[model samples]
Target: KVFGRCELAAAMKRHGLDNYRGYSLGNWVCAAKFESNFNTQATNRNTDGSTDYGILQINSRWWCNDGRTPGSRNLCNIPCSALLSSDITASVNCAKKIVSDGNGMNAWVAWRNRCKGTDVQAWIRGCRL
Candidate 1:
């Protein structure tokens, strides 16, 4: 099924994060909330004033150079679009990659420890992602 914001939230809950637990999911969700409020179609103006796109808030121009045209090399290889599409597993998996080396939940534990006593606003300061 397509994982909208609510669906993603449910997945997180299933994974044991009642709130934004530290780690890639926590940090990534914070970025998503701060940047786009969990809008899958989110886009923003980059530092150089170009457009960025997607739910993961991927910087299309910077990360995927062929973002201007659909089905470009960057788009084809990575599951960027699929991440936004109705594929929840794919999206979560993609996020896992960013959060850790394909170790989503485990990575979160590491992230929490890393920021346990620190002021990690990047991972803890935002509306629940």
Candidate 2:
């Protein structure tokens, strides 16, 4: 399912993502925009044949798994397809786990290469709480 920016922000905040560690909601918001454009079902193939899953584009290489996709560690112990749902509880949980595991947003190339240090304030602009 596709979500608007503010809709995603609300979900992120309600999901307890506000000020998660040192990262701000703005960080997650912008990363989500660049990563999947707020589409929960978004997927992309990497050069190595692994795929990214869901709104945050969680990669199969170390995260979740589908029986069809190889090299998945199933580190989150959930099906990769589960992340594709509009109901994002699973994705949020898995993402929180990813951050706690020390990757932080750097695990997402979109966050590292795009959202970081690049006029990030606009990501949260016009959104209330």
Candidate 3:
């Protein structure tokens, strides 16, 4: 499912993403926009033999295990396929764990390069939440 911007934001909020780990809802909203463009089925393979999956693009290297990436930590203890589900619960939970790694939302390059150091309120404003 490809969610509309506000649709994804509302869903994320309902799932407890709002200010989770001290990051605002806009942070997650902005990251999803750049990471996977709100596409639940999005997947990107990396040169390091790992893959990024789902809306927030949780990775296989240290988050979810695709069972193909070597040295996978699978710290989320979920199969990578779970991240691709439209439900998004698995992806959200894994993302929370990733942020708690002490890197916060900087764990996502898209967030660091785009959402970080910006007025992220732009991402959530005008939404019919």
Winning candidate number (lDDT): 3
Q: Provide the clashing-pair count of each candidate structure.
A: 1, 0, 0
The best candidate by TM-score is: 3
> What tens-digit string does per-residue lDDT give for candidate 1 at 1-129?
323454556565554444333454445444445445666655565565445455555544323453453433343245445445543344444444445434443333433444344444444444354
Give candidate 2's whole-model lDDT.
Answer: 0.88
Clashing pairs in 1: 2-86
In model 1, the number of clashes is: 1
Model 2 deviation from the true structure expressed as Cα RMSD, one decimal place: 1.2
Off by over 4 Å in 3: none
- Candidate 2: where is the Cα deviation over 4 Å? none
Q: What TM-score, over all chains together, does every model reach?
A: 0.45, 0.93, 0.96
Q: Give the TM-score of candidate 1.
A: 0.45
> Please, what are the lDDT tens digits per residue for candidate 3 over residues 28-111?
999999999999999999889899999999989998878899878899999999999989999999998999999899889999
Poorly placed runs, candidate 1 (over 4 Å): 1-7, 12-26, 61-65, 69-76, 86-90, 101-129
When summed lDDT is taken over every stretch of 10 residues in candidate 2, the lowest stretch is 65-74
